[PDB]
Symmetry: D2
Subunit: 494 residues, 4 copies
C-alpha cells in the first residue's frame, strides 16, 4: 500500500550544510526552485559559489585529519551510523517522497515505492561493507612482510543530477562514508530540497561535523569550484557527457584528483522474434518512459525483429496512448511533468527534429497540459540509425522503434554508438541470450527485463557513457587509496 501524501509539504532546509550547521551563501544570494507541475516557485535556496565551496572543503579536510573522531571511528561504527541514517529516512519516508515529487515532478507513488525504497536499500547495503573491504597480505619475494592498507581517498567532491535526487545522493554517500571518506556534495539546482533535508538526518544520525557537506548552487560556479579545487582528492560526477569532459579536464588542470564519471546513453533494447510479446511490449514501454523518460539508461533505441515489428509497434502505440499523464500526487498518474522549462523545450525540439527527418510519428508529439511541463508520451516508428533522435539522448517521453533482420546485424547497429551505458535483450533462446549479452558493448545488459537495479550489482558505462562503476563491491574501489607496507623481517617463511 501507499500512505496518503501531503501535497504541499513544508520546507525545513534551504541553506548550505557545513559542519552540521546551516549557513547562508557568503554572497547572501538565493535562487528559486520551481514545482514543475505548476511552474510556481516552491522557495528560495542559498546559492553557493566558490567561497562557499572553499568553506566546505576546509571543513571536510579538518574532519579528515589523523586522530579526528571520523578517522578513529571503528569501521563497524561507520556502518552503524549508515544504518541509523537509513532508519531516519524510513521514519520520514512519506515526507521525503512527497517533497521529492514536489521538486522533481515524478509520481508520488513512485517516489515512495521506488526511489525511497532504493535509497534505503542502497545505504543499508553499504552499511554492511564498512568493515569488510579488506586489504591484502602479500607473499612477496625475499625476507619481507608485505601488505596493503585500504585507506579512504580523502575529501570527495560529489556532483549529482536532478532525475533521481535522493537516490543519486544515496549512491554517492553510501560508498564514500562506508570507506571513511568525507564529502562536499553539489546537488542539482532544479532539485536541492530533498538532499538538504537528508543532511539534517545525517546530523541527527550522529555523523561528525564536516563528514558530509552539501553546497546547493549552479554548475559553472559551485560545481566547477569542486572539480578545480586544489584540496579535493577525488571527484564523482553524474550527468551529461558534455559536462563530464569539463570535469576530467578540470581535474587534470588542477591537482590531478581521481575521477569517476556516470554519463548519458542511447541504450538499445533488442526484441528478438521469439520473445514473449506481452512482456516485451510492457518492458519496452517501461524501459523508455520510466521517470518521465529522464533516465540515463533509458531504452531509447528499441530494436524489433521484422517478423514481429508490426504487432509490437501496434501494441506499443496503444500502451503509450493509455499512459496517464497528470498531477503526480494523483494515484492514477503514470507520468508527471519534465523537471524544468529547459528540458521541456529541449524535448519538444527533438520531437520536431524527429518529424523533420522522416521518422513516423505514431502518437503524441506535443504538450499534454496548459500548466506545468507536461509532454505527451510520443512514439516514433521506422527510425533509422542516422536520424538525430536515434543518436542523441532526448531524456524525455519519446520512444524510437527501429526494425532489424538478423542477430549479427542488430549487434553491429546496437554497438555503433559512442554511448554504452546499458542494453537489453528479449528472447527465449539460451544461445541468443548468451551471444548478445557477450557481444553488446554496455556496462549493464538486461535479459528479458529492464531497469533492474540492485545495490549489489555494479552500474556504469562503456565508451563515453562514463568510467568506473557504482553500486556493489566495485563501488568501493574509487573511494579507496591503496597503500603498500613492506617490512624487512629476520627470515621469511611460507
Amino acid at each position: 500500500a501507499v500512505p496518503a501524501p501531503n501535497q504541499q509539504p513544508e520546507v525545513f532546509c534551504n541553506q548550505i550544510f557545513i559542519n552540521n550547521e546551516w549557513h547562508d551563501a557568503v554572497s547572501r544570494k538565493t535562487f528559486p526552485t520551481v514545482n514543475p507541475s505548476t511552474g510556481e516557485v516552491i522557495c528560495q535556496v542559498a546559492e553557493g559559489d566558490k567561497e562557499d565551496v572553499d568553506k566546505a572543503v576546509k571543513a571536510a579536510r579538518a574532519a579528515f585529519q589523523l586522530g579526528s573522531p571520523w578517522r578513529r571511528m571503528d569501521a563497524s561504527h561507520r556502518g552503524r551510523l549508515l544504518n541509523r541514517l537509513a532508519d531516519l529516512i524510513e521514519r520520514d519516508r512519506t515526507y521525503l517522497a512527497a517533497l521529492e515529487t514536489l521538486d522533481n515532478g515524478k509520481p508520488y507513488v513512485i517516489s515512495y515505492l521506488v526511489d525511497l525504497d532504493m535509497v534505503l536499500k542502497c545505504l543499508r547495503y553499504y552499511a554492511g561493507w564498512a568493515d569488510k573491504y579488506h586489504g591484502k597480505t602479500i607473499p612477496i619475494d625475499g625476507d619481507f612482510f608485505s601488505y596493503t592498507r585500504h585507506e579512504p581517498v580523502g575529501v570527495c567532491g560529489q556532483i549529482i543530477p536532478w532525475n533521481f535526487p535522493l537516490l543519486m545522493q544515496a549512491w554517492k554517500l553510501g560508498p564514500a562514508l562506508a570507506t571513511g571518506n568525507v564529502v562536499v556534495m553539489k546537488v542539482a539546482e532544479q532539485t536541492p530540497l530533498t538532499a538538504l533535508y537528508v543532511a539534517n538526518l545525517i546530523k541527527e544520525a550522529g555523523f561528525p561535523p564536516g563528514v558530509v557537506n552539501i553546497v546547493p548552487g549552479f554548475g559553472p560556479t559551485a560545481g566547477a569550484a569542486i572539480a578545480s579545487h586544489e584540496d579535493v582528492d577525488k571527484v564523482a560526477f553524474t550527468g551529461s557527457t558534455e559536462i563530464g569532459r569539463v570535469i576530467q579536464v578540470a581535474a587534470g588542470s588542477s591537482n590531478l584528483k581521481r575521477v569517476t564519471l556516470e554519463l548519458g546513453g542511447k541504450s538499445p533494447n533488442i526484441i528478438m522474434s521469439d520473445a514473449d510479446m506481452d512482456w516485451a511490449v510492457e518492458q519496452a514501454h517501461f524501459a523508455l518512459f520510466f521517470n518521465q523518460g529522464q533516465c540515463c539508461c533509458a531504452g531509447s533505441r528499441t530494436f524489433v525483429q521484422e517478423d514481429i515489428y508490426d504487432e509490437f509497434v501496434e501494441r506499443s502505440v496503444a500502451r503509450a496512448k493509455s499512459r496517464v499523464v497528470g498531477n503526480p500526487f494523483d494515484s492514477k498518474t503514470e507520468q508527471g511533468p519534465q523537471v524544468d522549462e529547459t528540458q521541456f523545450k529541449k524535448i519538444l525540439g527533438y520531437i520536431n527534429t524527429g518529424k523533420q527527418e522522416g521518422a513516423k510519428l505514431l502518437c503524441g508529439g506535443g504538450i499534454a497540459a496548459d500548466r506545468g511541463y507536461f509532454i505527451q508520451p510520443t512514439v516514433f516508428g521506422d527510425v533509422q540509425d542516422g536520424m538525430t533522435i536515434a543518436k542523441e539522448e532526448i531524456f524525455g517521453p519519446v520512444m524510437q522503434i527501429l526494425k532489424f533482420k538478423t542477430i549479427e546485424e542488430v549487434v553491429g547497429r546496437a554497438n555503433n554508438s559512442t554511448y554504452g551505458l546499458a542494453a537489453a535483450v528479449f528472447t527465449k533462446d539460451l544461445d541468443k541470450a548468451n551471444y548478445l549479452s557477450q557481444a553488446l558493448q554496455a556496462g549493464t545488459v538486461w535479459v528479458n527485463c529492464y531497469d533492474v537495479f540492485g545495490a549489489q550489482s555494479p552500474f556504469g558505462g562503456y565508451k563515453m557513457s562514463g568510467s568506473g562503476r557504482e553500486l556493489g563491491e566495485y563501488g568501493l574501489q574509487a573511494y579507496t587509496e591503496v597503500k603498500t607496507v613492506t617490512v624487512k623481517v629476520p627470515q621469511k617463511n611460507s
Copy 2:
C-alpha cells in the same frame, strides 16, 4: 655470477612495430639515440608521429574485434604466451642487459641482475593472472540472475619513461596482455632500443598481429597523438607530474578514455634514533643513489633524528665519496652517466641552486668525467623544508639530509608535500613503525628497507604522484571493463 657482456651490442631493431611487422615512419624521418657514456650516436630510430600512431591504433582495434584470434584465445593460453615471452627474454638476457646499459647508461651488472630479473618476474607473475581475475555472481534482489564479466578495456595507449626501459615495458605489457587487451606503446626517445627488440620477441612468442604495437618517437607528437586519440580506450602513463596533467587533460578533451598515472616524487626516508646505524646508512645511500638517482620513488628527503644526525651524515658522506663512478660495463662501476645532456644540465642546475640557497655541500657537486654525462655523488646537509632541493624532484645523484627532533614533527614535515609516491621508516620499535607506516601519506611505505619491489605488491602514488596502482592484483583493475548481466529467472532461490 654475471656473464661477460658484449660492450658493442649490435642493434637489430630501430623501426616502428605494427602488426608484427617493421615499418619506417610515414614521414621517413628518423632520430638519433645517444650512448650517455660517450655522448656518441648509437643509431637512428624511426620517428613516429600522429599518422604512425593512427596506423597502430587501427591495427590494435582490428586485433581486438570480436571473433579475432586474440579475443577468442583461451585466457590460459594468454598466460602461456606471456610465459614464452619471458623465456625468450631470458634466452636473450645477456644481450638485452648490455643493450640496456648501452642506451640507458646504467651499470651492466645492475641491468643483468636487477632490471632483467625483475622483467622476467613481472611477466611470469602476470602470466599466472591471465585466467584467474574472476567476475562475480551477485545475489541481487528479486527473481533475477545477476553476474559480472571482467572484459578487457580495449585499445590501451601506454607511454613509458627512460629510467627503466625494459622494466617499465614489462610493468605495462604484463597486466594489459594478461587481461586480453591490445597495446599501442610509446617508448622514450632516449631509450627506444631494448623495447623494440622485445617486440621482435613478442612476434616470436606467437602473439597475434596487432596485439602489441610500439611507436618510437617524441612526446609532444607520438605521445600526444595516443593520449588524444578518439579510438584509444585507455591510457597508462608513467613520467613527470607536469606531463601527467597534459595526459589527463587530453583524455577529458578527447573521448573520455580511462586514465592511470605514475608520476614523480620527493619521498621521505625517516631514520629514527633507535635505527640500526650501519644498515640505515647503506639503505639511505641506495635509496637515493640507485639507478643514477633516476628513480621515481628515490629517497630524496633523508630525515635523521638529531641524536644520531652527526654520525649518520659522517658515514653517509664517506659512503658517497667511495661510490665508484665510471664505465657502466666495468664490473666495479656503481654509478654510470645520466641518461642525456638535458638531465645532465638540469641536475647541475639543482646542485647550483642547492649551494645558493644555503644548503651545506658535504661532497661532490660537480662533473665527474670529461666525456659522457657523469656527475659526482653529491650530498647536501642541514637542508630545510623550504629549500628548492627539498621540494623539487632532482632525479640525479644528489642527496638531501634534514634534521628532526620528534616523531610527530617528522610526520607533518614528511607529509607536507604535493608528492606521495613512497616513504621509508628505520626503527627497531614496533609502535614507532606502525605509527609511522599508518600516518605517512605515501603509496608505499618501506620499513627498515628501501626500493623493495615485488610483482605481487602494488605500486602507485598519493596526491600528485599519480592515480591508480601497478603490479599485484590491483594492476589488473585499470585494464578491466566491468559488465553487469542481469537475467530474469522463473523463481530465484538461495
Copy 3:
C-alpha cells in the same frame, strides 16, 4: 553506563523451540539448571533427546525446501532480519545480561558490557555479509560460460558450550543465517536459558518457522543425535577436544556431513624482557583469569624471560591477591563462581596435582566461599613443560608461570603442544614481534594484547584445537556449498 540489574529475572522460556513454537520433550522429561553462585535450582528445562532432534531436523529440512519463504527470500532481507534480531536483543539487553549472569555465573557488568555488546556486534557484522558473499564467473578454456553459485550447505547442526552462552550462539547463528542455512542448535545443559529466550526474539524478528530450532538437553543424547543424523548436512561444534573427536567420528560414520571444530587449548603468553612491565602484567592476568578462566584461548602458559621473571611474578601475585571474588551482581566483583560442581571439582583436582608435581604455589589454591562454586585466584610459579598443569586445559582461575632465556627456546617450548588455538607476545621490538608471530603455531597471535576479538577477524585453532575458522569472511566458508555451472556457448570471447 551499567544499568541496575534484576538480581533474579524471570524465566519465560524453558522448552524446545521448533517451527517458532514451544514444545515439551516427547518424553516429557525435564532437567534442572543451577545458579552456580548459590547452588540452587533456577528452573526445569525440557530434556530433548533423539526423537526431539528428529522433529527439529524435519522442521529445518522443510524450511529449506526449494521455493520456501526462507529460500526465496532476498539475501539483503536476511540481513534486515539479522539486524532486527540484534535490535531486539539490544532492547532486552539488561534482562539478557542478568539472565546470563544468573545461569552462567559471570559478573553482570561483564555480561552487559562485554558478552552482549559482542553478541550485538557479531550479528550486525554478519547481517552485512548476507548479500555480499559472491560466487565467480570463470574464464574456463573452450567455448563455455562457467560460473559458481554460493549456495547454503543446508541443515546445520550447531552444538555450543556454556562459557559464553549468548556469544557462542551468535557466532554460530550469524554466519549460518547470513548465508541462508537452517539451524538445529543444541545448547549447553549448564546454560540453556539465555539462548532459549533469544529464540523468542528470533520469532519476533520475523524469521520463518523452522529456520532456527533449539533443542536443550544432554550431549550423549541430543548432541550425538545431531552429529549422527542422516539428514543433517553440516555440523559446527565448539567444546572439548575429546568430544570433537566423537563429532568427526559420528559424521564419518553417518552421512559424511561437513564438519568444523573449535576445541580447547593451552595458549602460551610470551613476555619478552623488553616488554612494558605494567601492561604485560595486567594483560597476562586478564589473559588467564577472564571469565573465571573458562576461556578456550586462555593464556594458561605464561612464559617470562628470566631477567624480568622475579618482578613480573611479584606483581602478578599481588594482582591475583587483589582480584575480588564474590556475588556476580555486585559491581565490585571481578570473578564469579565456576559454571558447575563438576568443573568446580575438576579445577581443585588440578590445583592438587600442581602441588603434588612440584609447582610452587604462590597464592590461592583453595575454595573461596562456603556456598556456590567459587575458587580463589591461584598462581603457580616455576612451572616446567612436563608438568600436568602445563599440558592439560584447566579451564579455571589457575595461572602457570614459566621461566625462559632465549627467543629460540620459547618458540620451541610454546609450539611443543598438541594445542594451537592462540598465543601472545609482549615486546617493544619490531623484529621480535614479527619473528614470533610467524613462528608461533596458533590460530591467533596477539601482540602486546590478549583476548582481542572482533567479528571482522577469524578465530580457530591449529593442530588439535580445531579445524576451520569462525568470524570474519572466513566464517562463511563452512556454511557455503559451491556449485559450478558450465554452459556451452556459440563462441567464447574475452
Copy 4:
C-alpha cells in the same frame, strides 16, 4: 595429431619415493601390476606399508620445518618449479601416455590428447596461484592492526584412485605444492607406474627432497596408515563413498586432521524435449561411456522427456553398437578394457542385476573379448528409479535410460539420491536451463554439454559425493591454514 606409441614402454620406476630417492619396502615385499588389455603382469612394485608411510611422513615433516629450503623458498619460485615439472611432463608426454594406457587400459589417443593435456593445464594453472592467494588486512575494532597469514596446512596425505592416474596426481599436487605444503601420496595399486615416473620428474624439476613422497601399496595398509597417522595434518581422498567414510572416521579417531573427499556419484543427464537431438545423443553417450564408464561424474541416469524418448533410445542404441572396443593402442579403438578383474566381475554382476530386475536390455550385456577385461557397451531402457542399476554406481559401460514427463517431476527424481557429484541439462530454452541448473543438487551442472573440466572451475560433490572442492581458486582453501595476527597500535586510523 598423435605420435605413434611404444606399445611396450619400459618401466624405470617401481619403488617407494622418499626424499627424492627410491627405496624398497622395509619388508622387501612387492606386488604385481597387471595390463588389463592382456591380463599379463607388467612388473612388480614395492608394496609400501605402515613403516614405509612412517618414513615418508617423517621426511615430509622434516622438509616442512621452519627455515627449510621449501619453507623459505619464494612463493613465485614454487610457481617456477611447478612450471618446470609441467615442461618435463610435456617432454615425456608420448612415453607417459603409453605407460598410462598400458597400466590403466584407456585408449592411447585419449591418454595423449586428454589425460596428459589436462595434467599439463592443471599444474600450469596452479603454478600461477603460488604467489597470488593473498591473506587479508582487517579493519578490526579498537586501536589494533589485524591481518591474516595464509600458511600451508602442513603434511598432506593424498590418496588417489586408478581411473585417471596422472590426472588425479596433478589435481592433488598442483594446489598442495602451490600453497607450500608437503606431500605423502598413496597411488592406486592397479595403476602405480605413471605416478612413480612423475616422481622422477619431480626430483629433476628441482623440488627439495621430502616435499613429495610417493608410497605405492594397498589401501587397508598404506592408505589407512596415512589416514590414521598422528603427524599428518590434512588428508585428501578420492575414491568410493564407502572408503570415504573410513577416512573421515580415521581422521576423527587419530589427530583430528582436516579432511576433503571426492567420492562417487549417480549423476543425472536430463534431456528436455526441445534439445538438439543429434548433439544430446552424442553427449549422453560420452557422458556415460567415457573412460570405459570409469568416471566418478558419469551420466549414469539419462532422463529423457517422453515425446522424444523413443527416437533418443533408438539413436543411443545405434551409437552404442557402433562403439569400437579393442586394443587401446589401436587408433580406431574407442573403448579399452576395464581396469581389473574385480571391476570386470562387478560390472557383469550389475548387468545381470539389471536383467533380473526388469530393465530392458537393448544391446550388449556381455563380455567383449576372450583375453583382457573387455565388456560390451550395454544400454538399459525403461529403467525405474527404484532399480539397483538406477541407484548404485556401476563404474562401467552400462547406460541407464529413464523416461519422464514434466520438468518438476525430473527435478525431484534427479535429486532423489544420496549422490550429488554432477548433473546435466540439455535444452534450448533459457528459462528451463536456469530453472534446472538452480534446482539440481549437484556440485557441477553442465548445460548442453558434459564432462567439461577446467583447471579454473571447481569440482566436487554435494551430499555423499564428497566434501570440499578441487580445481580453481577453491582448490586452495583446504591446503591453507589461516592465522590471525592482531597487533596493538598507538592510534588506529582509517
